[PDB]
């Protein structure tokens, strides 16, 4: 141990030391045991002392009022405020617990009548309990904000909440995150009780401050509560929050006619829309928000009327881009050999050694125009996604990768080799086959990026990705463990052996190439049938055949059959997740002369400047 | 039949003969029928006789009191104790039933009032009914110990249990196994009723004997009851037994703060810990104990902070050990042939016949140091596990094998060949390829022993083991049945045939090697296309192809697909069973300068010398 860095996490161990030492500070001091209990008979003596430390601190800086607030002794705490009036005017002062007063803690007890007596002792509710135990993180179980009625918001006690409001509680105060009361209601674990908490707290603003008047306010990172429920995936309240958002028109027996506001769902301007905030997460449960009556009908209108024409024609032109690129790359200039087959005895079989800048003929001019287009088209790829990563971060760019498929890397990786294949053409380098070789195969792989606009072959592409980054990768870290052994084991066998017959391997690098082919059974297999092989070979070849082909190959095809039925229900909305992610990027990049806006605008219908959308259906 | 040994088990047949003969002893003697029933009117005559044998024995040695204790005739048994006061002072005296008094048997009747009248007749409870029908084994349905209130413990009758205690019942008496009352409560089949039996029996000790005062006592093999529930897998009571073990600190609304004792869970010293006793069994249900709130959080702390660094670096060095071993074994010294290709006409193709102790050159010195390391490192393997089997038994060593994987054998089997490859190098033997051949391949197989510290490829290794010892082994005992037939059947066909064409087999041993390759379809297949083959061959080759490749191969890949979904839920805790078994051995072998101890020690916190651990969570 000499170079440990960022691999301790001893702060969680440190607060545990803060836990037990604080209990020792309880145990040594006598009056804190009387603060741990009622102990009212001895407590009458404790305040009738000379030097009873009424303002002393714990290990994290409590008082007896703080401990009585913990162990909810309402009778004993009545004695505390008698000779110590200043005692209510002190919060917690530790790094872990900063700003927490006893008025906060009785709210955490969530069934108290001391809170009346505490506010009878002029207790301010203007505290900000912003200790490090109160920040949202995967190391605390709660996240309650900074404020007393905000703390009361998370515990569902209408008797206390209304009693907080009637003593001057500013409801529209915010936290260090910029989040107010209403933001914290969304992130609660119990989705049930917050709806009554939301509906009751609506009734107390009624205020002339028309500036974002009670809930239209974002945080420092610009997140509004109606949009926040889509972020954290509130299935329950988003239906409930849509009620004042939805406006109805008329009904017809079992039929109705409604209208949607839509004004903070579609991308109006350059602002972060709701739809953009859907796919920009790793949270799983927020993706099934797309099965709601305002949501998918916007999606299943504009892709039906605009996307499928725009996707296929964009799909069509990319198909044209590669075939002419295939046309030129199969027609490369070529001469025969010049250097007379000099050095290797029967170990060369190439005879061409390709041409140079001597190029001018009335046939290459077709190829000259042909390879001219694919260079300039490759620049176009480097003018639409290269400007993205100047502002879409690095990890923020890779955040899109796993959700929507890793195609955005490979399309630049296509054009990256296209830069090479004209430079080395220009300077007349030796290796032209190798940079074209990736360049030919990486283009046709990007055709499956357009295998998304059809239901019949769309979702099949997804579980390919779920096995390349999934079960094939875990298979590779055992397959290589098998083949690195047997190949070296095979190599010593025919080491003492002439390679003119059974030249399946004669040297160690080709041996690994051979034994890998023995693993996948894509080759023939060694047999000479004229000379008996060495005595070890017949043992080791068959044993390799059993545990790899009969066992390990057929095991690998079995484990993927386990995958499909337990990913079958989820892949349908993944296919829906393809469309919307395709929709927003296609909508945002393409200009205003194209793409008429969704919905129906106002400005002629007496309904504002906004944009409405309807639906009608049988209620049955 | 002349040499039968240990293949009878006629003792179970023998006790059945003891059953029916005892019923005949009932049937012949007249008063035992009156002991089989009430028969009180004739029973008034039976004791008013001259030579009524009041102390006689059955076939296994009953009395009429014993039979009345069986057929629970409380009215008739009142007559028995009148003229026979000594009759209560006799237990059963057979080999099968030894030490069983009638006071025991009325407790087995579990709803009696004769037990008051029996103890009114000064019946001792100091009996030890240790007959061979009372030993724990897979040949009796119960195991109740030796004592009356111990017998009453298994029947849940608080009216009788308290009546046993108030007549001088030593609760802390033990059996021949060293097990007391409380041990027998754990091994009961009904997990429900014992909790009330445990909680009630706690209240009667209260005694000044601080020596293991009521339940801290082990048996002769050193097993304490709190540890015994982990041994026999009591899911129910281990949560219940943790209540006085767990100590709480404080709560916070829906949040709490507790603390665990832990003092008989982690390996404190050289004693048999709880965690050691988990994996040292074949019992299945005891392995799901690891899903409890004191248990896995110890596991999911110290492997997260210490194991994964220690496992990977141990995983790293073994990867270095084999590549230099690969480096030397591919660079063996070699000369060309000397003996002029003398004996076989075109049946040798080797031309090297490797070198001897003529070795000194400034290139082999690198290999000399290279093979020096792998010899000494092989000794290190034989210094850590060779000392284990001096005290970890033979079958006790193989008891670890099936649970954690059969890698402990193969790692010595690795170094076993490493001893050979330097001796035969020293004495210049002929065969160097063959002992290296196992030695190269057996090392790389042990790399998958380090394919356990990752979730992505860890559990995939387990069902490999569940098919090598599982479905491939049952496939081998039919595959060999197929291929031993057809190969001999094939051999006579091309027996009357020249081997210069279609030399797939020309002799019987190579034929089995060929037909095995025909089974797995890893070779090409016989075709000459110039001479018609014999008339039998076209029939027998295709029929072999159907029932093996089309039928038997594809059947074998189908039956393993049946396995995965019905082993899918269980393999997750098997992967957890990997970690803890890795944890204890890594912890015990590595010394005190490494591995800071788990939990938080006392000695400064007013809580003893012990070691505490906490958790905090939402109760919700
Ligand atoms: C993942 C995993 C976990 C545990 C074990 C294994 C397997 C690893 C190597 C296997 N052996 C089998 C074949 N053997 C050659 C042989 C030896 C004698 C013979 O008569 N025929 C063939 C060489 C290596 C054993 C088991 C894999
Ligand atoms: C496990 C098990 C249980 C019960 C039965 C079997 C099979 C065993 C041998 C099988 N036969 C089928 C093929 N037959 C050659 C043939 C004969 C006539 C023909 O027209 N074509 C091909 C040779 C042996 C029959 C069934 C296996
Ligand atoms: C190519 C291939 C190789 C191996 C296996 C398979 C298929 C055969 C078993 C199937 N599994 C999953 C479905 N399951 C049905 C079921 C039964 C009860 C229930 O409550 N729900 C669902 C039955 C077992 C799926 C996979 C295919």
Curated annotation (Swiss-Prot), chains A, B:
By what name is this protein known? Transient receptor potential cation channel subfamily V member 6
- Catalysis performed (reactions): Ca(2+)(in) = Ca(2+)(out)
Q: Which gene encodes it?
A: TRPV6
What positions are modified (Phosphotyrosine)? 143
Which portion of the complete protein is shown here? 59 to 678 of 765
Top-rank lineage group of the source organism: Eukaryota
Which residues are exposed on the Extracellular face of the membrane? 331-367, 426-431, 495-507, 528-538
Region Interaction with S100A10: what ranges? Answer: 580-584
Q: Which residues lie within the membrane without crossing it?
A: 508-527
